[PDB]
Amino acid sequence: KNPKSDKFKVKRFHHIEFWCGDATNVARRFSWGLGMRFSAKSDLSTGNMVHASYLLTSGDLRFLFTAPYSPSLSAGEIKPTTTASIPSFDHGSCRSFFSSHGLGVRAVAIEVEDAESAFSISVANGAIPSSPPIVLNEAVTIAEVKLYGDVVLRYVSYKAEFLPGFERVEDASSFPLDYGIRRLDHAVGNVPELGPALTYVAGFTGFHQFAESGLNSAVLASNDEMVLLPINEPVHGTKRKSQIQTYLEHNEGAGLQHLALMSEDIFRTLREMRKRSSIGGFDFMPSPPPTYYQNLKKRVGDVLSDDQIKECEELGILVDRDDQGTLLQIFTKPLGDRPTIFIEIIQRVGCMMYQSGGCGGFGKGNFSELFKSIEEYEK
Amino acid sequence: KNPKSDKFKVKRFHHIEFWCGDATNVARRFSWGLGMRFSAKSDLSTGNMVHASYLLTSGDLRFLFTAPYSPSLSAGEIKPTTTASIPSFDHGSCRSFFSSHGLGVRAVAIEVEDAESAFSISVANGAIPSSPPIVLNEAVTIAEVKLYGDVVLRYVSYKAEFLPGFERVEDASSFPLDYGIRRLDHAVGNVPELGPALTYVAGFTGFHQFAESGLNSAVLASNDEMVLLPINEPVHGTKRKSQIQTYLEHNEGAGLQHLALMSEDIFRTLREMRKRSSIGGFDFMPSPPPTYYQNLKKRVGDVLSDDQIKECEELGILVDRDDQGTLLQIFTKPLGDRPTIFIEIIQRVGCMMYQSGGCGGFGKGNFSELFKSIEEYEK
Ligand SMILES: Cc1nn(C)c(O)c1C(=O)c1ccc2c(c1C)n(C(C)C)c(=O)n2C
Ligand SMILES: Cc1nn(C)c(O)c1C(=O)c1ccc2c(c1C)n(C(C)C)c(=O)n2C
Ligand SMILES: [Co+2]
Ligand SMILES: [Co+2]
């Protein structure tokens, strides 16, 4: 059941912004590890005396990495005279965020028809304002409201080329890496209490709820279910400590837990990423035992051939099924020093009309199947 | 003239420590860009609840990357019960350093015969103490005094395997990269006033002075001239703004300007580094004009063949000569967001007895020769 209750017109995920201590080193690491190209910059060389911002792209996926300069470089500026390309940026907020949480996502940005209307409707419906709507070069409008913890939901709308004040990256520094990642599928938050978090976000967006292990969760979705925002809470008192609780402890509270990146060829993406794990890229969680891939024949034997199942086993890929589609997924180890944010690589098969959002679910069935596999491999 | 006036026995450079916001991403970027292997760690997985520290090695070169965890993880600890592997570490100092200077060198570490005696003699001779001598597992002693700005000179001595509490890195995560870098040749500081900086450092070490462009500089050296610590000050009032002054502005004061890394085969190192510049590694300063390499025939035609001169031209390598040896060198663009710290790759030819320290100088003649080359190429 999809009541299509969005309180304003939402299009697609637009970008994810990481707040960093040094944007250069994080962006270069991510570029090589994920196969994303350097496509735009806003920094000292573009006249920005406030923050260094670097944009990586793969397909429609946009990752922005931002760090503050010394405040002394811009001490004479005021907001009317700022050289910052992102007017919501604040030195103190960024330093406070990074000292509190470490490397992590500050903004989940969605493209909307009208960022000023989106902001006004959200705040009229309970959203806590973070940055009021600001029109950039009479071309783009940006506004921000609080999502959870110190993460903001950023609205971007275009009258008619990332943002004004960003420059295209020169082709010499713009090596055309591509491991097959094409877009953001979903962005997941961890909170101490799921109920109040869901009520708050669904309250100001009109997003609807989309259709033992240490977590309870729920998924909020836009009208066409292309913007997907799951939220998790921990389950206490279990034998094994909840990984959601571990997140909250090491992150100093609520924040973004994982980004799921859709691949157009998850086999190629994982081959390319795994080749680079020990040479500057990303590590992956330990692979399931062979009993898992043996049991996959009975579960997904009508969707994947035996060869493709064998290809899943080489790469450590997980498979899950809903009533409408099938999910291939795998998880990285945490992206930085703290056991907090990580990345999921996903590919979905089924639900063709284009492919509808959330085809195959989010893999919650893999908890029990991994468990059964571990017990079976112990035998 | 070498008066051999060291006030305590100094051996060699031991390691360089960077203070980071996220040590994982910086260390992974540096590993791929410079061809250094992950060799040791001290972090949550080794019981360290205080800081994450990762050691990269290439030959005798040791780069350490350290970042703080949330103070909440260690809030119940006191110094007698600390889980930190580097007892001088302090959360507040590290956050203050990074917010002030950005990514940069906190410690220049030299191995000495007795770190406690080195500390006591230094402080008795004017050194400002930073961290008193601490014996680690009855095996290693570490102590720190201020060098310039917020950079410390760290003394390490071994009774008889980086530091106690560091664990060797498992071979799966330890990919054997190697682009030919073998050791630290020199470490250079930028200060506002050279005189007082030299007097201070030479005062407490007994290091001696080793044998138009925007800088004045001088080099301090240990007895065998294997530890080399140049210091620069800006020259004001020139047409072009001093790059030393630019450093001081963007760094918020004095600090380490560049690390010069000796290669056993600078041609291989530069081929390997340049292949990776646009895929996560390091960029290099713009190459000199072809008139430079034409003029090199008359300057170094007796040391390098025409083919090897042509190889220098492909890779953008600079060449300088002293009275005793020849210097091949090249400089990276800044390592992070700010126009502050960069790296020099160096190889020295001549002065064989082993090779004596500082063979060929430090390349100051390349200022005039680059200038002449630029005017000649304008023609
Ligand atoms: C669950 C869940 N709910 N929603 C809305 C999602 O997007 C998810 C997941 O992406 C997911 C699915 C299966 C997992 C898993 C995750 C994070 N992890 C990590 C290590 C915790 C596992 O070990 N397994 C087996
Ligand atoms: C000088 C100097 N003194 N000492 C003690 C050193 O180690 C040096 C250098 O390493 C050096 C030599 C030549 C240079 C240079 C540097 C840093 N730069 C940078 C961009 C400023 C140039 O453009 N040229 C031509
Ligand atoms: Co997921
Ligand atoms: Co040098």
From Swiss-Prot, chains A, B:
It catalyses: 3-(4-hydroxyphenyl)pyruvate + O2 = homogentisate + CO2. InterPro entries: 4OHPhenylPyrv_dOase, 4OHPhenylPyrv_dOase_C, 4OHPhenylPyrv_dOase_N, Glyas_Bleomycin-R_OHBP_Dase, Glyas_Fos-R_dOase_dom, VOC. It is an enzyme of class 1 (oxidoreductase). This is 4-hydroxyphenylpyruvate dioxygenase. Belongs to the 4HPPD family. GO terms for cellular component: cytoplasm. Its EC number is 1.13.11.27. Binds 1 Fe cation per subunit. GO terms for biological process: L-phenylalanine catabolic process; tyrosine catabolic process. Residues 12-158, 183-333 form the VOC domain.
